[PDB]
Amino acid sequence: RVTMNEFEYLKLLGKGTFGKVILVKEKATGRYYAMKILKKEVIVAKDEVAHTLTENRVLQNSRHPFLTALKYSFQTHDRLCFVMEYANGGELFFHLSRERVFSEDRARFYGAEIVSALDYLHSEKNVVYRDLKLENLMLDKDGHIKITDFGLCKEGIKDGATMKTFCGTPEYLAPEVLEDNDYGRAVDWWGLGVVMYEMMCGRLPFYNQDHEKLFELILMEEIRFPRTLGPEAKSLLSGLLKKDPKQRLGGGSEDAKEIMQHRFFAGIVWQHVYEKKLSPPFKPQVTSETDTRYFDEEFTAQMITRPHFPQFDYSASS
């Protein structure tokens, strides 16, 4: 079990309303980690307490190749710290920004890994993620997907159990969430649809700057694809982006299993996906370990610096 001092603070990785994320070296071990440092004041003040707890709990009982692991989690008078595996590869949002579009093969690979991760969360942990977006998908040193940021998860969601909470990111919301209907775990598939759409198409499948106009598109406009998109890719995206959740690929009792069987994924051996036996299509090219290429210069070129939370503190079992 640890405190603020057991770490050296090497580089800034992001700054936002709720805090910052520092690349860190752990003194006792030499292992580099990513520290999310939240300002307790802000969390309580911005009402983000319940979400923060949810993230602690979700990370604590999930261990998966493609979900960000959590090593330690602790506190101070003014701070909540999450100490986590470093995604050297930065956000998928970073790479798309610069390449425009990914090949189908490369999108297939990232999508298999997301499907593996969302399946584990649904079937093994009874969790619905709810916030699938490019920003939330990172790459590790090898170029495997890492889903980060679990504060919007819903827990104890078994089979067709349904939720009411209006949350996510506007551009990514499922039609059933927009209808203000009850909704089930199929919302994650709508999301997988969107990120996979962006990966292969280079744009979002629905977009206006005005939320209400964006929401109409999501509810009313049927999808359209670039004319170069192959039929299996096109069928997958159509199935994932059905507005009716009961028609969505992944929407039945089969869940993930329905997507795993789709012709788009014909080549894939799901057990090799999980075991990282597949050729990642992109290894992040870092000279060293505090190389922060794939993180914004706005952040990486900077110099670094109220109640108690019951049972917040946690260390990763050996």
Partner: peptide
């Protein structure tokens, strides 16, 4: 690409 997006809740 597009502008960076914000996660919210209500």
């Amino acid at each position: 690409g597009r502008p960076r997006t914000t996660s919210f809740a209500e």
